[PDB]
């Protein structure tokens, strides 16, 4: 009966309100649900209750989800996307579909920042672009996200992709850029970075090497 309660339920908050603010009702369902489920039943029921209110609730309308959370993802929204994970990771054939779209947001994200190379700061700024989408974006899978590794090893073939990138025909750039970065921030002359700067950019680069093809 809480079946198909919920199946009509969960059909009826979609027909009145967008996948943004659908997460916070149906979130403010299963907070409400898991409260009422142990004033009333026995301990035994509560894992057999909330997963049957999620599979008429989520794994139902999954299609819904996975088709929406494309503009979840790719707009950075922390408090959106927060909800948006949750939801699809009781589902076990809903997380899958959120981790290959966000590895796409990396690439293209990667894509972005490292197509505007200037000739001449090529090494300093590869590696710094490279590490702001790493910096921000491990951020992001451990402030609005859980540090699972599926979203890291995600992070990591998005990040190795983007990195070693192969033109056709043409040679990556990537072992020459990250080397030369080396050897611009070793250099006594023009103007140094006393001893404790350099060794700190430089544990920060052992990052972008790992992703060298």
Same mark, same amino acid.
């Given at each position: 009966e809480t079946g198909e309660? !919920? *199946?009509? &339920? /969960?059909?009826?908050?979609?027909? $009145? @309100?967008?996948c943004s603010q659908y997460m916070e009702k149906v979130l403010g369902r299963l907070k409400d649900e &898991?409260?009422?489920?142990?004033?009333?039943?026995?301990? @035994?029921? !509560? #894992?057999?209750?909330?997963?049957?209110?999620q599979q008429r609730m989520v794994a139902d309308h999954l299609q819904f989800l996975h088709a929406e959370c494309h503009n979840i993802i790719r707009? $950075? *929204? +922390?408090?959106?996307? /927060?909800?948006?994970?949750?939801?699809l990771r009781a589902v076990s054939t809903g997380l899958p579909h959120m981790i290959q779209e966000l590895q796409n947001h990396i690439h293209d994200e990667?894509?972005?920042? #490292? @197509?505007? %190379? #200037?000739?001449e700061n090529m090494p300093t700024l590869f590696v710094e672009s490279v590490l702001e989408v790493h910096g921000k974006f491990v951020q992001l899978i451990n402030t609005v996200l859980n540090g699972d590794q599926h979203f890291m090893s995600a992070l990591d073939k998005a990040l190795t992709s983007v990195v070693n990138y192969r033109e056709p025909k043409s040679?990556? +750039? /990537?072992? &020459?850029?990250?080397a030369k !970065?080396?050897?611009? %921030?070793? *250099?006594?002359?023009? *103007?140094?970075? #006393? $001893?404790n700067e350099v060794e700190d950019r430089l544990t920060s680069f052992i990052t972008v090497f790992k992703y060298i093809d």
């Open positions: 309660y !919920y *199946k009509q &339920e /969960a059909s009826n908050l979609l027909q $009145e @309100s967008n &898991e409260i009422r489920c142990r004033k009333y039943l026995h301990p @035994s029921s !509560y #894992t057999k209750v909330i997963h049957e209110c707009q $950075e *929204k +922390k408090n959106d996307m /927060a909800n948006m994970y949750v939801l990667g894509l972005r920042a #490292t @197509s505007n %190379l #200037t000739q040679v990556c +750039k /990537a072992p &020459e850029l990250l !970065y080396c050897d611009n %921030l070793l *250099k006594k002359s023009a *103007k140094g970075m #006393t $001893e």
